[PDB]
Amino acid sequence: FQGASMNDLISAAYSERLRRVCDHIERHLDEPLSIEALSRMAHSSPFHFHRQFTTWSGLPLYRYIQWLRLRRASWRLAFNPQDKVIDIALDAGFQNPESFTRAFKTAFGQSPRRFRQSPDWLAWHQRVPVMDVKIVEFPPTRVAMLTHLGHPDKVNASAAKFIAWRRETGQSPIASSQTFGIAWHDPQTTPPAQFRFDICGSVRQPIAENDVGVVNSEIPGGRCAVVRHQGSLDSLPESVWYLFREWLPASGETPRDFPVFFQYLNFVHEVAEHELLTDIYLPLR
C-alpha cells in the first residue's frame, strides 16, 4: 500500500511528543528540571523516561544538557569577546574554568581560547557524536624453557617437570622473573603428534646445563599485540581466536616469525580461576 500506516502515525506522534519535551528542555535550561513533569509531558513513565530519551536522542539527559550548554558557551566565546572565560565557564554550570576547559577539549577538539581566536565551526558540526588490544614493544628476554612435543594433555605433566626444576636448581623464575608459554600450535587444528608447547621462565643469566631437558632460549623483542585475558587456561584459545579474527584485518600490521606467547602475571593455582590474569602476545613485524 502507498497510504499512511497507523503504525508509522503512532511512531510519529511519539517522536513529536519527545520533540516537544526536547524543546521544553532547550527553553527551561538553567532551571530545576523535575523528571516527573517532563515524564508527564511525554505521556510515559517517570521510571522509563531516561531510557526513551537515551534511545531516541542518542545521549542521556545529563550529557545532552551539558553539551547544549557547551554549544551556548561556544557561541559566547566566538561572538562575545568581552565576556570573561571564568564567567562563561560559570554560566555553563561548571565550578572551575579548568574543568570547563577539560570538557571543551574533550568534546570539541579545540581549546577554548584557540576557539575564541580561530573558530573552526565546520569541525564542530562534524563532531556532534569491546576488548582493548594494544601495541607494545616487547623487550628480548633470556629464558629457560622446556619444550613439550606430544599429546596436548600430557603438556600439564611436562609443566610439572618445569615446576620441579624450579624447586631443585634454585633458579627463581618465581620472583624478579617472568613465566611465559610459547603456544606454537592450536591443539584442535594441529596434529597432536607435532604439538609443540614451550614452558619458559625468565632468567637473568644462563642456567648451565641440566639432564631434565630445560634449555636456554630467548623471546625476541619488537612490535607485539597485547590482549588481556581474564580467567581459565581453557578460555585462552577463544581470546586467541578473537585476536586473529578482529585485530589482524583491522590493524593492517604483519606478524613476524615467532609463535604466539602468553605471560602469566598471576600464576595458576595460587589465586582462583575467576581472578586469573594472562597476557596474550602476538609477535608483530
Author numbering: -5 to 123, 132 to 287
Task: Copy text verbatim from the article accompanying this structure deposition.
The DBD is connected to the C-terminal LBD via a short helical element and a short linker (approximately 10 aa), which was not resolved in the electron density. The LBD shows the characteristic GyrI-like fold of 2 SH2 motifs with a pseudo 2-fold symmetry forming a central groove that is clearly visible in the crystal structure despite the relatively low resolution of 3.6 Å. The dimensions of the groove (length approximately 30 Å, width approximately 10 Å, height approximately 12 Å) provide an ideal environment for accommodating compounds of linear architecture. Despite presenting as a monomer in analytical gel filtration, STM3175 forms domain-swapped dimers in the crystal, where the DBD of one polypeptide forms contacts with the LBD of a second molecule (Fig O(A-C) in S1 Text). The relative orientation of the N-and C-terminal domains of the 2 molecules is not identical, resulting in an asymmetrical dimer (Figs O(D) and O(E) in S1 Text). However, in contrast to other GyrI homologs, STM3175 lacks the highly conserved Glu residue in the center of the binding groove, and the charges in and around the groove are not exclusively negative as in most GyrI-like domains. In STM3175, the groove is mostly lined with hydrophobic residues and extends into a tunnel toward the C-terminus of the LBD. Attempts to crystallize the albicidin-STM3175 complex were unsuccessful, but molecular docking of albicidin to the crystal structure of STM3175 suggests a binding mode where albicidin is positioned in the central groove of the LBD. In the best-ranked models of the complex, the N-terminal half of albicidin occupies the binding domain groove, which is a well-described binding site for other ligands of GyrI-like proteins. The C-terminal building blocks D, E, and F extend through the tunnel toward the C-terminus of the LBD.
